[PDB]
Amino acid sequence: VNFNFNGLTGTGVLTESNKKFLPFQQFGRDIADTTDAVRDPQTLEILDITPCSFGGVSVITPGTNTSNQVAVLYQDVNCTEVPNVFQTRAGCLIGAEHVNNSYECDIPIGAGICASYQQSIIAYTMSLGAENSVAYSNNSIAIPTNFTISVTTEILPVSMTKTSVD
Amino acid sequence: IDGYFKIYSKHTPINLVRDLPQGFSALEPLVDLPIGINITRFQTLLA
Amino acid sequence: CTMYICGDSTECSNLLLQYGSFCTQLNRALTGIAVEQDKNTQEVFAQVKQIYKTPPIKDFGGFNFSQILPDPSKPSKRSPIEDLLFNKVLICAQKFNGLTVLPPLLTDEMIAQYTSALLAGTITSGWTFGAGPALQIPFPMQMAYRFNGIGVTQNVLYENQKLIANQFNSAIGKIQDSLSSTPSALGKLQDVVNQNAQALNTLVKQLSSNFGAISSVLNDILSRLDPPEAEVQIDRLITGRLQSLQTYVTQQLIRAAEIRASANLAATKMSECVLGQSKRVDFCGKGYHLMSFPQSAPHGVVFLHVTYVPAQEKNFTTAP
Amino acid sequence: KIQDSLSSTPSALGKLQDVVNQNAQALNTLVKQLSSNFGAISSVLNDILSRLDPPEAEVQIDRLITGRLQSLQTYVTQQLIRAAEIRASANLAATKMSECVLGQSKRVDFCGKGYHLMSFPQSAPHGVVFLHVTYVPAQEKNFTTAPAICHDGKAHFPREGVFVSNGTHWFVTQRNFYEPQIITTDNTFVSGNCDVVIGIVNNTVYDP
Amino acid sequence: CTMYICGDSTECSNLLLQYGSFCTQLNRALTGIAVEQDKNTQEVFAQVK
């Protein structure tokens, strides 16, 4: 709701507070020095005031060379309040079907969720890089036999267009 | 100050005979008096 | 920029839009910063192809490591000493003015998974896993490889291996006691968390700063001023608050540059001190570097560097 | 593979395309601030001087110049921070150039992913491309190990390698490549005895 | 900030106080710079016990 409590204005969700206000004191502030509690002016209930949940929207997509199907990310917004919905710590992601198979991260979402296109768009719990139980023991040694030579290109900036803005 | 004559009071237990206690208390506001007066002197009334 | 400066105000946001692309370069810069932290984190911890796991029987050649490696005992896959570091080292209140915190791609449990996998990789593979597939190797021969690398013969390790194991375990206990007792011991991490807490707390107090305006509070300015006067007072607020945000972002970019240099140093130390044996003297801690251990920390890493340090002195005469 | 991967995949050169693109966006963004109003009656400088007279223009233009100067100051300061990042990358590039290109580094994972052998510079628009030739282990083989060798009651340690458990013919091989060689005094050394180390398997050594 | 911008002026310093913490972060940053040179000098030269 949009609230106006004795001149204090904002938009948010009103909940019951358990703070023991003394009789002449009407409202409180946090470390940020912004209002976070109000005494209702008509009935003497102590209320906590918080704003409504919001966050940025990221678009999960394969390139337009491949498909026009997308998934929508509501970052740190609870599913219930939103109106293939998957609840995760980062929020509710709508339009991608959640699967149990972890894969390499393609489009990262955050808080452990990555998405990829496999065809359709899927959402999954992120792999940290497949899985490999190493056969470790106190008396086991592995030694590479045949080797391969790989060349990896690592690019470092050296210069910039030498602009000069008079 | 600035149009308010502000009076504070606090009621607490004490256990000293001859001094001010150690410990902390804060004086709450009771009433805000809308009197723009210039106060510079006072006297204590005893019975 | 739009929500922080002209929060829940279409008219103010439209006035802010008259400054062109500042919102696209500040939001692009901060998005780049967030991506930069995911990239630096991925350079330090997600630098290993696969997730290696230790066996159920933690027989690591007589060197106990149950202190630094996660314990199934905690519900979280977190270590006990590392758990002490996490306990030793508002978010709604911050969010409420449009200054939100984005979750890491890798959760604290996933940071624990990388530090456990990377640390397990170091223990079970020496330096070969950082250059390809993981070999298995017992930890005392790994100590022999690292001593040979630092120019110290293997026989000192093997002859006093029980004493070195006892000194290492006692040293770990010293870390446990020093970090639990001494609050300033973690000053290098406490200062980064403190600088970020001060940067955000300072930014919110600047949201409490007036900057020359009739009022510091944006909802009251829109409730008190009509557009003809409001345009001048909001322009004053945009200049002051936008410069304050520009200063915040500039501090984050310069501090990010210092953190980036530290992250390059941390990744270099990770690879060369943790995933290898460095021959660079006093580069990886004070002494002759043997190995290093990653530990998860809030928004950071703690390295336990095992170093060789001469103790007792003895004089001899020499000749060229 | 480099020719085909880079020719096919446009994002393969993303780190350089991104640096050139960031500089292009910084310049294009600067021009969009020249197209930005900042609160002024008009964004076009020629139109402002063609439009306003000195007695009102000095105060109104002083306000417009003030705003555009903060925008240019922001560009240059932000450009200084980015330049510091390219400068740091350049310091990394010069160090990588000297020890990885003009030498051989023993720093693991410093000069590319694998064991660094050499690099080749390539010219690139306003940047450099390094072709790093690295040694990377491929195929796996399991062996049993031992911490030390007890030959005549003395503990023998390798100078350079690791012992391989064929099963009846233990051999030592260099750390990064399986190539078993006979255990000799020319590739091992003797120091102390076998009675203190836990787990020695007391196999045989040869005295060439 | 007070001395450089509103040097030996209480009225100007009081006007300056309307910008909140900019002087606390500028003086803190520059103090950090001074501490930073002492820390860097101590790492380069005071590296021996």
Ligand SMILES: *[C@@H]1O[C@H](CO)[C@@H](O)[C@H](O)[C@H]1NC(C)=O
């Ligand atoms: C969403 O709301 C329900 C009840 O309102 C709550 O049980 C659930 O935990 C919430 N989701 C999150 C992620 O907190």
Ligand SMILES: *[C@@H]1O[C@H](CO)[C@@H](O)[C@H](O)[C@H]1NC(C)=O
């Ligand atoms: C995926 O995982 C959830 C939770 O473990 C499980 O309930 C579900 O049956 C799994 N499989 C599919 C096909 O969703």
Ligand SMILES: *[C@@H]1O[C@H](CO)[C@@H](O)[C@H](O)[C@H]1NC(C)=O
């Ligand atoms: C090693 O692997 C390569 C594949 O790149 C192969 O061509 C070569 O014959 C192999 N050599 C041996 C000795 O296995």
Ligand SMILES: *[C@@H]1O[C@H](CO)[C@@H](O)[C@H](O)[C@H]1NC(C)=O
């Ligand atoms: C593990 O550490 C504890 C110290 O808490 C020690 O008592 C125990 O012996 C160690 N375990 C092994 C197998 O060495």
Ligand SMILES: *[C@@H]1O[C@H](CO)[C@@H](O)[C@H](O)[C@H]1NC(C)=O
């Ligand atoms: C072990 O050494 C013998 C030498 O007699 C050799 O013939 C054999 O190929 C080696 N490897 C195995 C697995 O037996």
Ligand SMILES: *[C@@H]1O[C@H](CO)[C@@H](O)[C@H](O)[C@H]1NC(C)=O
């Ligand atoms: C070699 O080890 C065996 C263990 O089975 C032991 O019985 C034997 O005495 C050892 N030989 C020497 C020469 O120490």
